[PDB]
């Protein structure tokens, strides 16, 4: 029971909880950042063929 270290442990609890939360946020940002083109250009080709 070292007063500062024991409370630092419970502080690190939330600190790393939110750090991993934000890393997950970055990952999910990237997972869709590229998705704004692959589905928005390969699917729109369903109409140019009929138009031609």
């Amino acid at each position: 029971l070292t007063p500062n270290q024991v409370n630092d442990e419970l502080n690190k609890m939330q600190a790393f909880i939110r750090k991993e939360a934000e890393e997950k946020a970055k990952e999910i940002q990237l997972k869709a950042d590229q998705e704004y083109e692959i589905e928005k250009t390969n699917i729109v080709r369903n109409e140019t063929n009929n138009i031609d």
């Binding site: 070292t2 630092d8 442990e9």
Partner: protein, 50 residues
């Protein structure tokens, strides 16, 4: 045991305990050895497995 815990987890843990009232015999030697029960909690799963 508590000292090695304190000096392997590096001075950060919750460790409270209560003693065994009216102890019982062991099983390795069939001897009424004084006993204690403990409780421990931590955040890390690696800690748990260690």
């Amino acid at each position: 045991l508590e000292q090695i815990l304190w000096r392997v987890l590096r001075g950060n843990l919750f460790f409270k305990t209560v003693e065994i009232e009216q102890p019982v015999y062991d099983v390795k030697t069939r001897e009424y050895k004084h006993k204690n029960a403990f409780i421990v909690f931590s955040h890390g799963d690696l800690i748990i497995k260690r």
